[PDB]
Design a protein around this ligand. Structure first.
Ligand SMILES: *[C@@H]1O[C@H](CO)[C@@H](O[C@@H]2O[C@H](CO)[C@@H](O[C@@H]3O[C@H](CO)[C@@H](O)[C@H](O)[C@@H]3O)[C@H](O)[C@H]2NC(C)=O)[C@H](O)[C@H]1NC(C)=O
Ligand SMILES: *[C@@H]1O[C@H](CO)[C@@H](O[C@@H]2O[C@H](CO)[C@@H](O[C@@H]3O[C@H](CO)[C@@H](O)[C@H](O)[C@@H]3O)[C@H](O)[C@H]2NC(C)=O)[C@H](O)[C@H]1NC(C)=O
Ligand SMILES: *[C@@H]1O[C@H](CO)[C@@H](O)[C@H](O)[C@H]1NC(C)=O
Ligand SMILES: *[C@@H]1O[C@H](CO)[C@@H](O)[C@H](O)[C@H]1NC(C)=O
Ligand SMILES: *[C@@H]1O[C@H](CO)[C@@H](O)[C@H](O)[C@H]1NC(C)=O
Ligand SMILES: *[C@@H]1O[C@H](CO)[C@@H](O)[C@H](O)[C@H]1NC(C)=O
Ligand SMILES: *[C@@H]1O[C@H](CO)[C@@H](O)[C@H](O)[C@H]1NC(C)=O
Ligand SMILES: *[C@@H]1O[C@H](CO)[C@@H](O)[C@H](O)[C@H]1NC(C)=O
Ligand code: NA
Ligand code: NA
Lengths: 529, 529
C-alpha cells in the first residue's frame, strides 16, 4: 500500500450507482483511511466511518467497499499467505472440500431464508448488515459494485474463508478431514487498591498470518430494520485485525459502550459432539461475535446474543469486561464487571465472575476451559489421564506461570512484559518431561514454537517445531478504553528469545508477502502511529 | 525438490490399481527422474520413460503421474508464480472468465465426442494420449489415481492453463478481454562449406516464468489404437520446458526422428479474424504441437498434422529442420531440410525453404511473419504505416542485427553469443526515435525490458519497462541432435548487460519461489548437468 490512502463511497445521483473517490468527502455513504506502518511498527491502521443519513444496509455494504479499496494490496498479500490454496482445484481431500462447499452454501442459504421470513427482527437485521459488509468487501475488491435490495449470494470460498478461519478449526474434524495450536493467552488484572483494571490479550497464530491492521469502525447502525429504532450501543469499536477479515479474529475489541471483549480458543476433543455442528440453526462464530459486540450494553446482554444459534465452531472462553461497572479505587460491586462465557458444540455456559476477579485480583486465560462441566464434556479428562497436567486447568505450564508472576503487573508496561514473556530455556515451568530436550518453547505465555529442534521427541503435535506461536500483545486500561485506545506490540516475542527473522529461520521457504524480514517491534499506542 | 528424486508407477495386480513407488522399477508402467540444479545451472532435468508392454493409454496416463510425483514442489511454485490468480474467484473481468470457462468446456467436450465417434482414427488416438497425460499429471498432483477406460473430464482451470499459456494470448482478444511481448527469436545457420547446420532458439518471456526443466520423454506410443500399428516416429524427444507444462511452451524440440522443431510467436492484430477461433473444429496449439511432433517423419508430414483443426490461437512461425535431409559438407539437396509454417486465425501457409537456407546460408526468426500473405492478412501493414520499420519484416531492429551479425556464428559458442546478444546502450540499431531516451532494451536479439526507465516516453507497450525479455538460449548441431543433445543457458542475458537480480531490480515485490535471486548462469550441455 501507500503510506496513507483515503477513499470515499458516494451515492451518485447522476446514475443512482455507487462509485469510489479519492480523499475525504462529507456526504459520502462511507469513507476509509489506511495508514501502513508495517515496516516501522508492524501495524497498519484503518479508520472507517459511515454516514448516518443513509440506511444501515447501504452503510454496511459501503463499509465493506471503502475498506477493500484502501487495503487492496494487503488483502491480496494476506490472501496469498493464508488461504490461497485451501480447497483449490487440487485439494487432496476431495471428499472434505465437497462437504465444506455444501455445508457453507446450505448455511448461507439458511441465513437468507431467515432474513426473508423475519423482516422486522433486530437480530436478523444485524446478521444482514454483517453479511452485506462482507458482500461489499468482496464486490469492491472485484471492482464491480452492485448493492442488493433483497436477497443476495455470498461466495463460499471467497472472502468468507478469511472470516471463517477460526471456525474452520472445528469444521474440519466435524466433516471428517484427516489432518495442535494453543491459540492465545489473556490476562485481566485488577491493580492494588483497585486503582485501575487492566485487560490484555496475546494472540498465538501461524507466522504467515502476521500482516496486521488495527481497525477503528465508527458506524451508524440501528438496532432494527425500522428507523424508529435507537442506534446500536456498539457503533464505535477499535480492534486488532487482519487484511480482509472484517472482525478481530485473534479477538480483542474495545467497544464505545464501555465493553472490552476477548477470548482464548478452548476447542473440543470429543467427537460425539460434532453432531451439533449443522448448516441450519447454526451461525458461524465470527458473525455471532460481531452481532453481540454491536447490540450489547451489559456483559449479560452480550452473553445472551452470542449464545443464539451456537454453531460449535470456533470454541472459546469469552471474557466480557464492562468498564461502566468498574469504579476506580472502589470496592467490589458484586456483579457486572466480569462475565465468562464458554462454548463447545451444543453447550454454552455463562457466569458472572466479578467476585472471583476481586477475591483473587485477576483472571487468566489459556487453551483450557474454566467451567468444570465444559472441561468434562469436551473430553479433556482422558487427555489429563493420558498426558498429565499439560491438559489440567490449574496445573498446565501457562496456568502456573500466571500463578507465580501475575501479581507483578502493576501497570501497562508490566502487563506487556508478562504477556510477551518467554524464557523456556531457563524457566523450570517450561520443562517437558516426556520430551527430548526437556525445555519447550510452547510452555510460555507468548509461545515461540519455531525455537524447538526439528528433530526432537515430542508426545503431541502442539510441542513440535512450528512456524507458530505468540504474534502480538494488546493492552488497555480504564482511562484508555474511555478514550478508545490501546497499547499494541506486533510480532513474536523478543524480550528474551532471539528476535524472529524469516531469513535466518528454518521457514525461509514459506511465503510472507509484505511482512518484515526481522521482527523487533516495540509496543505503540493507538490511535495512530 | 531434492537434488535427485526417482518415482515409478506400477499396475499392482494385488488390487488392479495404480500406485507410486520410490526408485527405478523395471516392470513399471512408467518411471521418472528429476534432478534439480536450478541453483547451480538454472535448469532442472527430467528423464521420463514408459513401458511398451502396456497399452498407449495407460502409458500416457502414467507418464503424467510419474512426472508430477518427481516434480511436485516445482509445479506448486511455478503455478504460484504464473497462473495462480488467473480467473480466480475474484477476476475483475467476470464477463471474460465466464466466456473462457464456456469456451474451454465446450472445446474439451468436442474433443471427447470426436474420440467417441472415431475409435479407429490415429489422429484422435494421438490427441487422447496427450489429454490422458494431462489427466495423469493432474490426478497425480491431487494424489488420487483413477485411470479412465472411456470418456473423461479435464478441469478447465486446472493444469490446463499451464498448457494453454501461449494459446491464451489469442483467446483474450478473441473473447473481448480488455488488457506487447515480442515472444522469442530464432536462428538456423548453415556453416561455411556446409560443414554443419546449427539451429538455435531464445525464449522471450516474463521473468516470473523462470523455473525451467529440460525434459526427455522416452515413450512407447503407437500410431493408432490397434496394436498392429508401428511405433510413432517421435517416441524419443528432448525439449526445454517448465514445471507442469507437458510440452515445450517456449518451443524447442529435438526429436528422435531427426527433426528439430521451434517457433516464434507472430500473433495477430486483425480482429476481423477472431471469428475463426471456435470451440468446435479447433484444437488448441499445444496439443497440435505434440501430435505433430509424435507422428512426423518429414517436415512436410509435420506441417500436414499441425494444420489440422487450426485454432488461430498461439500464432507462430514454425521452423522444422530435418537432419535426415542434411548431408555434411555436401551441396543443396534442393528440398526437405527446412520447412516454414505460419499460422493466423483461419489461415495456414506452408513452404519448403531449403533453397533459401542454402542461398543465403541462414534463416532468422522474430515476431514478424515471413509470408507476404500472412503479413497482410494479420493486419501488420497498418502498423508499419503508423509506426514505421519496427513492424517491417526486413527493417525491424532484430532483422537488421541478424543481417549484419549472423555470418559470425561459426560454431556453438558463436551461436550462443549472438542469441544472447544485447548491447542496447551502444548499438545504433537499438535506437528508438519515437522514444525518450532513444536506446531501448527491447531492440536486441535477447531482450532486456527491465533495463528501460519506468518514466520513459514510449510509443507502445512492447517498449515500456517490463519484467520481460529473453530468458534462455538453446542450441544444437547435426552431431548433437544425432545424440539427442543440446546446449542450454538459463536466465536473462548478462554478456554485456548487468546480470539480472530480483533483489536489486524494480520488481523485487513480484513473487518468484524457487528462483535464484541472481542470474549469472553459463551454457551447459545436456544430457545431465
Ligand atoms: C436503502 O437505501 C437504498 C438507496 O437509497 C435503497 O436502494 C434502492 O432500492 C430501490 C428498490 O427498493 C431501487 O429503485 C428501484 O430499482 C428497480 C430496479 O432497477 C426499479 O424497478 C424501480 O423502478 C426502482 O427504481 C434503487 O435502485 C436502489 N438503489 C440502489 C443504489 O441500489 C434501499 O431500498 C434502501 N433499503 C434497503 C432495504 O436496503
Ligand atoms: C489398457 O490397459 C488397461 C489396463 O490393463 C485397461 O484398463 C482396464 O479396463 C477394464 C475395462 O475394459 C477394467 O476391467 C473392468 O472393470 C469394470 C469396472 O470395475 C468391471 O465392470 C469389469 O468386470 C472389468 O473388471 C479394468 O479395471 C481396467 N484397469 C484399470 C487399471 O483401470 C484398458 O481397458 C486398456 N485399454 C484402454 C482402452 O485404455
Ligand atoms: C486518516 O484519517 C484520519 C481521520 O481524521 C486522520 O487523522 C489521518 O491523518 C489520516 N491519515 C493520514 C496519515 O493521512
Ligand atoms: C464422520 O465419520 C463418522 C464415522 O467415524 C460418521 O459417523 C459421520 O457421519 C461422519 N461425519 C459427517 C456427517 O461427515
Ligand atoms: C469430570 O470427570 C471426572 C471423571 O473423569 C469426575 O471425577 C469429575 O467429578 C467430573 N466433573 C464434574 C463434576 O462434572
Ligand atoms: C536419473 O536417472 C538417469 C537415467 O539413467 C540417471 O542417469 C541419473 O543418474 C539419475 N539421476 C540421479 C542424479 O540420481
Ligand atoms: C467481441 O466484440 C465484438 C464487438 O466489438 C462482437 O462483434 C463480438 O461478438 C465479440 N466477440 C465474442 C464472440 O465474444
Ligand atoms: C500487402 O498490402 C499492401 C497494401 O497495404 C500491398 O501494397 C501489398 O502488395 C500487399 N501484399 C500482397 C502481395 O498481398
Ligand atoms: Na483465538
Ligand atoms: Na513463443
Amino acid at each position: 500500500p501507500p503510506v496513507s490512502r483515503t477513499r470515499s463511497l458516494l451515492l451518485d445521483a447522476a446514475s443512482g450507482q455507487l462509485r469510489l473517490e479519492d480523499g475525504f468527502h462529507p456526504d459520502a455513504v462511507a469513507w476509509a483511511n489506511l495508514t501502513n506502518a508495517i515496516r516501522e511498527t508492524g501495524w497498519a491502521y484503518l479508520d472507517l466511518s459511515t454516514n448516518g443519513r443513509y440506511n444501515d444496509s447501504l452503510q454496511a455494504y459501503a463499509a465493506g467497499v471503502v475498506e477493500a479499496s484502501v487495503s487492496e494490496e494487503l488483502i491480496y498479500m494476506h490472501w496469498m499467505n493464508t488461504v490461497v490454496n485451501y480447497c483449490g482445484p487440487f485439494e487432496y481431500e476431495v471428499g472434505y472440500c465437497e462437504k465444506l462447499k455444501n455445508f457453507l452454501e446450505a448455511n448461507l442459504e439458511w441465513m437468507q431464508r431467515e432474513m426473508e421470513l423475519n423482516p422486522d427482527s433486530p437480530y436478523w437485521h444485524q446478521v444482514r448488515l454483517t453479511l452485506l459488509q462482507l458482500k461489499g468487501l468482496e464486490d469492491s475488491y472485484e471492482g464491480r459494485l452492485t448493492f442488493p435490495t433483497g436477497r443476495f449470494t455470498i461466495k463460499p470460498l471467497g472472502f468468507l474463508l478469511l472470516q471463517i478461519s477460526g471456525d474452520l478449526e472445528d469444521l474440519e474434524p466435524a466433516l471428517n478431514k484427516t489432518n495442535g495450536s494453543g491459540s492465545c493467552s489473556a490476562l485481566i488484572k485488577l491493580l492494588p487498591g483497585g486503582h485501575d483494571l487492566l485487560v490484555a490479550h496475546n494472540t498465538w497464530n501461524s507466522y504467515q498470518n502476521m500482516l496486521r491492521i488495527i481497525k477503528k469502525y465508527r458506524l451508524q447502525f440501528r438496532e432494527g430494520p425500522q428507523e424508529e429504532y435507537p442506534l446500536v450501543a456498539g457503533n464505535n469499536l477499535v480492534f486488532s485485525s487482519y487484511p480482509g477479515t472484517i472482525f478481530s479474529g485473534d479477538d480483542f475489541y474495545i467497544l464505545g459502550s464501555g465493553l472490552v471483549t476477548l477470548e482464548t480458543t478452548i476447542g473440543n476433543k470429543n467427537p460425539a459432539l460434532w453432531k451439533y455442528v449443522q448448516p441450519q440453526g447454526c451461525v458461524l462464530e465470527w458473525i455471532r461475535n460481531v452481532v453481540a459486540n454491536r447490540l450489547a450494553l451489559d456483559g449479560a446482554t452480550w452473553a445472551d446474543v452470542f449464545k443464539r444459534f451456537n454453531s460449535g465452531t470456533y470454541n472459546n472462553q469469552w471474557m466480557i469486561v464492562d468498564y461502566k461497572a468498574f469504579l476506580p479505587n472502589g470496592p467490589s460491586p458484586g456483579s457486572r464487571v466480569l462475565t465468562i462465557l464458554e462454548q463447545i458444540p451444543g453447550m454454552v455456559v455463562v457466569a458472572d465472575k466479578t467476585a472471583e476477579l476481586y477475591k483473587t485480583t485477576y483472571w487468566a486465560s489459556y487453551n483450557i476451559p474454566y467451567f468444570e462441566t465444559v472441561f468434562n464434556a469436551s473430553g479433556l479428562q482422558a487427555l489429563v489421564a493420558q498426558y498429565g497436567d499439560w491438559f489440567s486447568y490449574t496445573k498446565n505450564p501457562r496456568a502456573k506461570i500466571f500463578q507465580r508472576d501475575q501479581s507483578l503487573v502493576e501497570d501497562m508496561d508490566a502487563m506487556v512484559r508478562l504477556m510477551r514473556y518467554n524464557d523456556f530455556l531457563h524457566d523450570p515451568l517450561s520443562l517437558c518431561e516426556a520430551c527430548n530436550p526437556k525445555p519447550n518453547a510452547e510452555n510460555a505465555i507468548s509461545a515461540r514454537s519455531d525455537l524447538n529442534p526439528a528433530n526432537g521427541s515430542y508426545p503431541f503435535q502442539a510441542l513440535h517445531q512450528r512456524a507458530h506461536g505468540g504474534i502480538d500483545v494488546k493492552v488497555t486500561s480504564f482511562t484508555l478504553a474511555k478514550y478508545m485506545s490501546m497499547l499494541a506490540a506486533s510480532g513474536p516475542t523478543w524480550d528474551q528469545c532471539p528476535p524472529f527473522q524469516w531469513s535466518k529461520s528454518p521457514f525461509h521457504s514459506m511465503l510472507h508477502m509484505g511482512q518484515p524480514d526481522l521482527w523487533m517491534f516495540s509496543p505503540i499506542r493507538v490511535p495512530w502511529d
